[PDB]
Amino acid sequence: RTLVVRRFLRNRAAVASLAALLLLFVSAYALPPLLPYSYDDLDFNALLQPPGTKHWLGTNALGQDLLAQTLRGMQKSMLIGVCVAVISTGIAATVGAISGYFGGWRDRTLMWVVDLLLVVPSFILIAIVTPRTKNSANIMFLVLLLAGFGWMISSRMVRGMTMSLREREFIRAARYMGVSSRRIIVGHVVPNVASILIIDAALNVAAAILAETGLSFLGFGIQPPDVSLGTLIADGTASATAFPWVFLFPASILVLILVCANLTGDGLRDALDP
Amino acid sequence: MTRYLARRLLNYLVLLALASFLTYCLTSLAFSPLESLMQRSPRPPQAVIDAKAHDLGLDRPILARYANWVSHAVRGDFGTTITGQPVGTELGRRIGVSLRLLVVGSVFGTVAGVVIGAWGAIRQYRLSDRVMTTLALLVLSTPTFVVANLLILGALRVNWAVGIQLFDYTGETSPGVAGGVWDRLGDRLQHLILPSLTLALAAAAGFSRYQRNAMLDVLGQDFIRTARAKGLTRRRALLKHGLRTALIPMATLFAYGVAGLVTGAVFVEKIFGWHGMGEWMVRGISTQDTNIVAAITVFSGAVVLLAGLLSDVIYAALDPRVRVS
Amino acid sequence: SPLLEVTDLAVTFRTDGDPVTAVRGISYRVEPGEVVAMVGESGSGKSAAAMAVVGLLPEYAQVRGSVRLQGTELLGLADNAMSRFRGKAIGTVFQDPMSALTPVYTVGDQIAEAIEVHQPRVGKKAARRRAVELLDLVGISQPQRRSRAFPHELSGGERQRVVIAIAIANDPDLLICDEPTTALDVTVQAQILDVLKAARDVTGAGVLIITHDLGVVAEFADRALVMYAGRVVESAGVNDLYRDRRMPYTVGLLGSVPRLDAAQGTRLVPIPGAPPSLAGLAPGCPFAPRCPLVIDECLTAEPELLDVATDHRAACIRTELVTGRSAADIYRVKTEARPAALGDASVVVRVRHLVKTYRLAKGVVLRRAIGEVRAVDGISLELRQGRTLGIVGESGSGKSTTLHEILELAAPQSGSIEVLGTDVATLGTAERRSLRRDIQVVFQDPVASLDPRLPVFDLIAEPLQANGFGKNETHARVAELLDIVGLRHGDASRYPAEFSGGQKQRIGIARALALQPKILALDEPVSALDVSIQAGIINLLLDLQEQFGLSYLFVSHDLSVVKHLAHQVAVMLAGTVVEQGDSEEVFGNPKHEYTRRLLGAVPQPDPARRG
Amino acid sequence: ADRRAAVGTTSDINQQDPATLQDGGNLRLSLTDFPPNFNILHIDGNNAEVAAMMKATLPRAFIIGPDGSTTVDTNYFTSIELTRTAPQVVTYTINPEAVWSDGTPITWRDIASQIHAISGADKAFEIASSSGAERVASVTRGVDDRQAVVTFAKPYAEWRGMFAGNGMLLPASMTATPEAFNKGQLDGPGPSAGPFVVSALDRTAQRIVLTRNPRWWGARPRLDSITYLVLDDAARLPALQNNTIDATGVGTLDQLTIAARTKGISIRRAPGPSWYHFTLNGAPGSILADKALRLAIAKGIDRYTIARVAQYGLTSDPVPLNNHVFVAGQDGYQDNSGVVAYNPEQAKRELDALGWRRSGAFREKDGRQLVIRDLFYDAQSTRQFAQIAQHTLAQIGVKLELQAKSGSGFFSDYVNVGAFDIAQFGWVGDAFPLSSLTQIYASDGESNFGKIGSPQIDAAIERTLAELDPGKARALANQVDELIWAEGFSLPLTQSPGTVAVRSTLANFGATGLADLDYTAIGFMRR
């Protein structure tokens, strides 16, 4: 273990980005109960005011505080990102593993089915199902829908990983000394592939947030009175040209979240890959 | 060459012929178009419900419904919208508007990205590499709908500062060109700058990272050292021997690059107000329209698969290990 | 004026730690027509010294000193000026042919460009004729047809032949050959030596050849320099060196070379330990941690290469004690072949008329079969108790697949396999798994065969744990096995990446030995190890045979090791066993043409027999 | 920027001499939907923008001044006159020179044919409004070739409203056969008689162009052509910053500051009689069919904060509209809102008494949750009303669900059919306020899209129209209005502030308020 954390902790940018990402995630939940105004509380005396002594980040056209709104947007949009990345990596792991294990016709049917699923861009397929996930309170169905169409390219990397390792030599030596197959699995493959499945999760977080916020921007994702960073940017853009903060603050927060996720991904990959 | 290409053409035909089927089933399960009718207040008399169900085919089971749809689509009749307009009248113009955006975006984008990535890999860890890799990270981290609006705000401020409308960004063409053809083309170019730049940045930021990885892998091979040992200069070796070899991996990724640009064009067409296929997708999903969306998934699959066959031709032409054995 | 003169050349690379000083101030000279050899094991700095003279080191390398070619100094020149000497005056041959040629140009084109870039007036339609003529001169068959081939249509031998031609193009004044015959079989290697000799004859050039073995040096070279720890430590004519090496290091490096003139059971003379890390050396002689004659006087200041005999120099201060003495004497090793015990005439493995085929099919997306590669062709072979069988052949000869088919212990397509009186066809899983306790295998790659993230105790214990022995006892077993193979108790916690290559192969041997088997399958165990380390492992294998009564299947491409280990030999050609019998008969009196040729191709480290 | 947003007695156009104006050019103007039908007397084509095109193209009987006063249009008619009050009858007179674009003389038959169509006497014409053509006992010719005499069996003080104000005269060709009326004008209008006529249509780029009528017998216009383009909300102000949009209205503070800060644009202000509202579907099958629920919901919507949000920075002290028939600044205005004054606690008591118990976040009866579907045109100005209403209804426990829909076919495909539970849109009136009563609020009214009413309202309406003294007629109209409030028919929200942004070179064009444009006079100021 010690060597990988030593490699990562020397990567100052990556450790800094991971720190910032965790502090954002914690703040999105820990901070709101301390603020003077919540989301869904409207001050009709202070419509479209700039930042000041009572509205830390000003208000939007409805009189909503913009700080509280963005904390709520971060909540929803970062929770969906994490959950989608985890589930997507899980599906990718299982499909890739079974294909790269069996080889032969079963692999050539599972990789051809993945190739078929990639035929029409994923965003289109997600947006076709979205009328059914719209207008329900539980985010579960949106998370399931985003994960079910995100695992496909990761399946290919996992297929490689497995196919290469299935013919590595330490794996060979094992069979020649009486180790049972379950002992091979809990003993060798899990310790050796887990480190790269974690890279899959780290890289999928950014794509998951991108997908959710784009879908929300078009009006297909999260529905008012709930909010997402995509919802906030879509609401603010029609005002940005006259009053800029209502678009620049949510947008800068979203771009910062994505930059931190990508820095963490690349740095962690460079920490594992020699 | 013309064995590998033939065998992979048959594969793409089968992929499209099943993509259309499965996304028509997905569309026909996800959408319930008669909901508006069935929720009208003086509840529509059944005759209307049955009549409109028939006119849209909702009275047939999925398999027969799709058989009928293809039976007409292969004849060029893509059916009617939920409001009763034919789909075929829009489709040609929409495809034109969309392809003119995608082509310029992808051509300029991938060429720029390849050059930037090769330069970074050649000058690894020098200042120019540091700057270009972080800029690529930024451009890859901003969502398309943020980039488009940032550029629009920027143009607005330019116009105000310079004192004249320097950039135009609404629609594809202005009302009138006052005769002449040279201008009839010029105005369209002016309109096309910002929409296509929005896509070119995304493409360049992706392909620079991919090309940097591929070129760094090529610099790990011995044949660069062999080439220089013959008397070539460092830069002629890098270009003629390294960069041509590094280009081969890029030919395989272009299909997925185009799949990304097809997604970006939805946002670009909406934000800049271009009447193409991407805007039609949003309209069709919003109104629960099966036929609009069926036409659009066939287009979006076909454009991605033709990217694949062009990439297949280029990968055979570049690499001899598929030409001869 | 000397063709090449190097003075006080030094090279250092930079890393996250201290800069590793790969070359530490060497000097030498090369004359027209002369062949100079630089000899040394891995980590010795030879390759850096080559690429410094050619000027193709990685950009993270610093270079100092002087390099003069025909009187003009080469260090510090811009590439626009250096590339007027590369190719036109210095021609170079590189180590690994698998990557040496660019994959998207035909080989005739790649040679034609070589002549074109210094003779720009010549015109493509003349350069291509010269390219075909060079492919002819280098001995590639059907040269005008193969001139159209792309590199992936060539074998390793053909690929290396094509690099020799890109180099003798023009007529380089100096030839620099960077380990040119590693990763090549012995027959191809003999042919490459012929080609290089012929190239020297036609150009008249001098040759600087860099090798890690003494066989090529005894055969090809005229002078030799021995590199150790980044400096030249002895130099002489090859006759003088072989017969009169005055330096403890060369005493060893020349006693650890296996020999066909030795009999089975002869122990080699190894050199203990491993080479120093060239980042931050200790004071005094670098060989002091391994020197068997080391005295504290040699730790006060690093010795200098000094004159000892006519044209002979050595960098040791105690050389008077080395004169005339054998390596066995100086290292106090009893090399004699000890009396073999009377093992019983019973047979522990027998293979009768075994056959297997690999299909040859064309097409990537869909496959069409167009022929059959008969990888194993009716082989009959057997192993007596307590003895070694040596299976030898070149790449693609099917020796390896034969071994690994035997170890899978399953019914073959035709023929039949017997192990300890049991036939693999009457063997259900309850019996097959119990039979695995009796034979295990040692693999050629210590990087791949050991789990990267499992400590040595866990690795050596794994057969014992999986076979169900208890935690109380397996600890004792591991502690004893580490002693048996000569590692220290205190290495169990260390992870595999922290060891040397020799140590990792000793771990593999311990792991295979874990159940006390009666047969061990040795799949190229000692290839790609330094020769002084190979000698130690060969001694270990022999000693374990006498200690425990083991039996070995030994499979290798080289024959020099096999003469020491093998009681019986079977030689394989393209899946067929074509000679078989006692080792002294097979190696003393071959009667098959292929076998006689294969034995003739083996490089011999004695230069006196150059008739 | 700030003023009161009530109907005044002035206008805001660059009044200039047409002769001094530039002798050519074109005027570019926006649309939100390419017209689905061009017969403005038919519900499909009775839209404010379709009419806004028609202004330059069809005749009118009277001209409306900046205070709402009337005068005869001597360019089309010589002398319209009220010949006798008691068996009420009036005479129209078309000018001795007057012709349609096809060559036909404009004749008493055209008055009669239009009157017959919009009489409502035959259901085959699916008219947008019956107006008073249902009050004309008969229509006949007089002594002269073109003299037209119209007799009313029943009184009608809005008799100036026929063929004037927001109303017009159509050729008999397109109003005599039901077939011609309903289906004769789906693609371009029929004959025309205005100073301009439509001469190019483009369903491909979504544009329409008018050009001067070469047969025109009035004043020679100071423009050659008028060009209409179809755009969405975000295409109206950014394209206004470009030479694309010549003029466009201003709906939010964002739009006002953009139009103020850009160069070559001026803000023009004259409040018109148009207003904006929620309308409730009280027809069989709609969850709001029960008037008790409609009143309970109405008490839970705070219209004052809706006004203050929606008109922020566009009005000095913004207030809601509290009257249906007359808007603020018209004579006879009054406040009749009391019955549904915002009081969410009594609304909670009412929803309890109606059995919609609190369960979860929202309320339920018989396991059915109380969700209201809200239908509106998707624009930044319209979303604010929806979001405030949704927020204040969530507090009382009613889910209100937003259905934002684009402009194409909005009325035809959703409003006309009745595909809503609550709908947002606005009414654009004119100087004849009682003309709206039988159109909208009567239980059989043509524009009663919610199908709400009862005999008391119809009786009071008739009683209001059956009188010849405005002083008392207005009081009766306010009684009608109070009954409309007591029903829970619809909720007026705001009155249009009249802010329009125009290109500073334009003259005799801008915000007219009550006034009509003189379509011969518009032009561009010489550089």
Ligand code: SF4
């Ligand atoms: S100088 Fe001394 S320490 Fe060095 S090799 Fe010679 S005897 Fe050994």
